[PDB]
From a paper:
Carboxysomes are specialized microcompartments found in all cyanobacteria and certain chemoautotrophic proteobacteria, playing a crucial role in CO2 fixation and serving as a central component of bacterial CO2-concentrating mechanisms. Self-assembly of the α-carboxysome is mediated by the intrinsically disordered protein CsoS2.
Fortunately, we were still able to obtain maps for the T = 9 and T = 16 α-carboxysome shells at resolutions of 2.77 Å and 3.71 Å, respectively. The construction of structures using C1 symmetry maps yielded T = 9 shells with a diameter of 36.9 nm and T = 16 shells with a diameter of 49.2 nm, which are virtually identical to the structures obtained under I symmetry. Intriguingly, we observed a complete and continuous density at the centroid of the inner surface along the 3-fold axis within the T = 16 shell C1 symmetry map, whereas the corresponding position in the I symmetry map showed only limited weaker, fragmented densities. High-symmetry processing involves a high degree of data averaging, which can lead to the fragmentation or even the absence of complete density. Based on the relative position and conformation of this density on the inner surface of the α-carboxysome shell, we have reason to identify it as the density of CsoS2. Although we were only able to partially build the structure of CsoS2 from Ser710 to Thr721 owing to distortions in the density caused by superposition and averaging of the particles during cryo-EM data processing, this result is a meaningful complement to unveiling the distribution of CsoS2 on the inner surface of the α-carboxysome shell. The results of this study indicate that there are also potential CsoS2-binding sites at the threefold axis of the facet of larger shells (with a diameter >44.5 nm), thereby augmenting the theoretical number of CsoS2 molecules within a single shell.
Residue numbers in the entry:
A (entry chain XF): 685 to 700, 712 to 730
B (entry chain YO): 726 to 735, 770 to 869
C (entry chain YN): 822 to 869
D (entry chain YF): 726 to 735, 770 to 773
E (entry chain PO), F (entry chain PF): 1 to 81
G (entry chain CF), H (entry chain HO), I (entry chain AF), J (entry chain BF), K (entry chain HF), L (entry chain CL), ...: 6 to 97
Amino acid sequence: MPTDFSIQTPARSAQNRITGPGMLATGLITGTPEF
Amino acid sequence: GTPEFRHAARKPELVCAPRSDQMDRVSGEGKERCHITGDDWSVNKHITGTAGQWASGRNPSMRGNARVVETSAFANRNVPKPEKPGSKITGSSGNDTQGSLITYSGGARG
Amino acid sequence: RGNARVVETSAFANRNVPKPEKPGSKITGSSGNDTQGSLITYSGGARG
Amino acid sequence: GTPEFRHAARKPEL
Amino acid sequence: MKIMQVEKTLVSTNRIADMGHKPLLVVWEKPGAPRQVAVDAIGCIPGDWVLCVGSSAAREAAGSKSYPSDLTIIGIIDQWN
Amino acid sequence: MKIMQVEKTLVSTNRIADMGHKPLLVVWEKPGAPRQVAVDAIGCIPGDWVLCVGSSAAREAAGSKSYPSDLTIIGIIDQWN
Amino acid sequence: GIALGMIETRGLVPAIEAADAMTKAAEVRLVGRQFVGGGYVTVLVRGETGAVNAAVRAGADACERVGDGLVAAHIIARVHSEVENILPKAPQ
Amino acid sequence: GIALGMIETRGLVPAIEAADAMTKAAEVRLVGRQFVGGGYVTVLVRGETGAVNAAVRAGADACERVGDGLVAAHIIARVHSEVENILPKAPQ
Amino acid sequence: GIALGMIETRGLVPAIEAADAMTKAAEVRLVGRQFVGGGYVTVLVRGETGAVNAAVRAGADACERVGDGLVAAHIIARVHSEVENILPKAPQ
Amino acid sequence: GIALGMIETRGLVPAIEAADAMTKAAEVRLVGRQFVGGGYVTVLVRGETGAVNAAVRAGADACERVGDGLVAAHIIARVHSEVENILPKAPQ
Amino acid sequence: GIALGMIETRGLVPAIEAADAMTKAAEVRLVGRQFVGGGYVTVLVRGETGAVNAAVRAGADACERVGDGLVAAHIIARVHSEVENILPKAPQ
Amino acid sequence: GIALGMIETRGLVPAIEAADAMTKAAEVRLVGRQFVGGGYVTVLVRGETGAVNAAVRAGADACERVGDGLVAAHIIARVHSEVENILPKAPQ
Amino acid sequence: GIALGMIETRGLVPAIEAADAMTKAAEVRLVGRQFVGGGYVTVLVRGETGAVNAAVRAGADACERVGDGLVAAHIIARVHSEVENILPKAPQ
Amino acid sequence: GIALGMIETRGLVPAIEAADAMTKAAEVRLVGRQFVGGGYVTVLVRGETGAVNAAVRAGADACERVGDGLVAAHIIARVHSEVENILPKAPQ
Amino acid sequence: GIALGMIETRGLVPAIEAADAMTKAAEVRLVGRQFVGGGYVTVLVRGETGAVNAAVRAGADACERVGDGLVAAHIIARVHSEVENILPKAPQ
Amino acid sequence: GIALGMIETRGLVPAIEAADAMTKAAEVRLVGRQFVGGGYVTVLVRGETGAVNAAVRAGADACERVGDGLVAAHIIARVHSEVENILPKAPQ
């Protein structure tokens, strides 16, 4: 019985965290901290 | 009465939850103790938005460790008190020993 | 004689209906605040 | 707020 | 007991809670006599000659031995005047 | 009960201790009538028509059976005269 | 007076006892008597707020042990204008 | 007279037995029979107080073991001028 | 307002309480009180969906302890034009 | 169409929900509402046979848990001409 | 009238609920809202005695489970000419 | 009179009860009402020594079980001249 | 929209967070902030009833986490005229 | 109204079912149906906050098992004024 | 002709097959075919509830094993007026 | 600035330390210091989002061990325009 879109999809390859310059070199910096 | 039927022939006690057993998040018209059926402004867990994490996570917050004594008339309700004034006065004075503690100059029972 | 013996909806059948907790009064001052008579009630189910 | 405190920070009933 | 005619009703909202939910009626020995008030233990319409009892008796008559009342209507006279 | 108007307050410092801390009010059936005194079990301002119970009941009316007074204000009449 | 007292009973004999007792207790006007259905009968009085409070309390005590009994005794001192449309003005 | 006897019953057979008994047992006038709903029927009589007391007593005893029985039997010595308007003047 | 809010009560005293509590809690209109029979009385109000939600919640809380009680509390935020025939336009 | 669909409920609140759920659900006309006594209310609809089958199922599901609930949900695809006299034509 | 209803609460939310209830439930006038300190808020109303009794009862029930709750609900039938000067004439 | 009675309470409702009861008990003048802070409210009366003794005893009994309760009832028959500087002369 | 929503919090930081959340979440206007004392802070929002309900709920969720937290959340759809005087209708 | 309700689905058939249930349940307005690509079809409704809560609840229940189903049911009682420029005004 | 039948399929071939089967099997007019994105196509019919309940059964039988298959087979017996804006008109 | 920072503390001495630590830490303005009541003092700062982030972290770390301590440390990156009316502009 035909069951699924048989077309492979790039978007549907996954599932049918915040990346920013803030991430870069976090450990190295020494300075005022925010939270 | 359906074709099938003829061929085949061949809950809460109270609409309003107990007043003692529930406390409502929003009192007043926001109360959810009574079960109103129908189209009623209530929202399933399916539905997302408006409240929950959508009101709670917008602004960062830190809850500090400072829970301190309340100085108030109500917190002082059970303050330690000195021994109650008494009266050894005799004669007709309206010397009631059973009512509220009236006191005279120097903490003398009145 | 068919098989249909069903509930009576009546004042007498509702005599032992489940009822919500009885209103009480924490009112003070001279109000004729009798707590022992029949349940009089005010607007909002407030004991009267 | 003592310099040290900051540096480190880096009865009867009646 | 005294033979007193009901004149009207009386209403004290600030009445003591010990009075319970009991009607109170202005009464008089004749029109123009001093007006007393009695707990209406019977149901009496205005203009009714009635039987009013003394104080300790009144309390029991009004429904409880400790009831606060020194006057109570214990009956309506079948015919008076 | 009697319908009596409050005229003023009364103060006995030498009152018996059994009277407790209870207000006392001069009362009268009309201005010019004999002045009685009643334990004010309700709070009554001067000029208030009031309901006053008599024997026995009064003792329970303010304080217990032990409490003394033979006259007590058991209410204020919502409207009189 | 514009306050509404009302006493409901399981039948008419308790209701007449309530109406009589309410009318006798204080200066209130018996404005209606209703057969709700199922044997529920309601008596409704309109008077001054103190008078209605005095009436309803006396009516309920009178009819509590009369007949099948009392259901409700309610006082409403300020009645909304919208509810005055479903309230009788004179008994039938 | 202006006294009222009311005998509520479950059904009309006990009410008609109650009303025969009341009317034969004292000089009282059957003023009404009311169907209240839920099978409550009130038979109301009017006469001087002693007649109403005798009548209500006879009626209660009569209608007690007839059918579904007596719900209430009540005497009102004097009836308020306001309760008069909720009371049937003549039987129907 | 085209939302309907209906409270059902056992008896009329709880229903009048609900009408009053609903009409005073929200800008709703008491449109009718219906004696369904079996001692069921339905009070129907009509206003905007928020006013009707508030009003029904208020009515339910208010009538839950007056008399025999609340049988139902319901909202119809949009009502079909067919049902407007079986719905009472004005309390009478 | 001449098919009859008939929801019956204990109370009027469940019945207005059933009527509204039956009218929104399919192309059917609400032909009447009856108070049968004893708490019972019967909403009746008329339309083509499939219209009525889809309405009487929408109505039953809607009012099933509203008020004292559903007593009967029944479809008759053609009614005898004698049964048309005991059926209302338009709601009142 | 010259009667006083006072409803002390812990917080102002229970006090505003207490004052809405009092004002809607009887013909009483909100004369003041006082912040006493320690989170005690007194809402005071003035009207004839029966109105104040109904109002204070409604208010107490209303403000009881709102927030930190009711500290006190008290009625004074007649208020001394001296207590008048410690009482707010108009709300602020 | 120059004697000073004074009654302190955990809130304003007990304080008004005390002031009213004191003013009603005997011929004393309500000279001040203070919000001490923390919810402590003090009522102060000035009158003849016997009148003030009668007033304060009656005030304390009145407010003992009202609200959160009584804190102090004190009588000072002869008040020092220096203490009359921290005593109010007329209430606000 | 005359509906009134008040959130009582312990502290001004919680109250401010609450206000922000309510305003952002729903259509409400921030009518007032009153410092109750004892540290209770009340933020009042007036809006359409439903809007007010949603806003208050959102605020409650948000405020509880920060500071001491929610003391109360209340919605009064219809505010009596008298109450309007006490609540700070003016935005300040 | 300004509340926005949004029911995304996997296909147009689950979104026409969701749109029908939303529009019938409450007084909302389909403000746009969107094809997002991937199969996602969003149904956006704008009405009062009470109406939108009722509508989205009805829509989410209706389309849950229809077709490929419900992805998201989401209510925003008030969007920011900049989020209103990426919202459709009328359906295409 | 107010009911809607809707077949969603994975491709245009299953959809054209369903359209043919539906239109041949009962009295339904083909109102539109929508490309939904992601390979979903939806064939909508409009007719009576029986015509349509018979068409959508016939259509799902045709296209179940044709191509990638059927995603949804839904019938809406009465379509809300608002939902008709998001529905293709019959010239499609 | 647009971002709001807030440090609540139990006492002024902890708050002055937070105000100093916050203002020294980043480019924020001390817009207010408020005595809430009950010994709660809030220090409020308005600057850019980055500065207010860095500042409020400095304050919370400084005042935590000072005196009674910190109740809360909150950043609102953009308060609603309505919350501006209840926010101080310059300390007093």
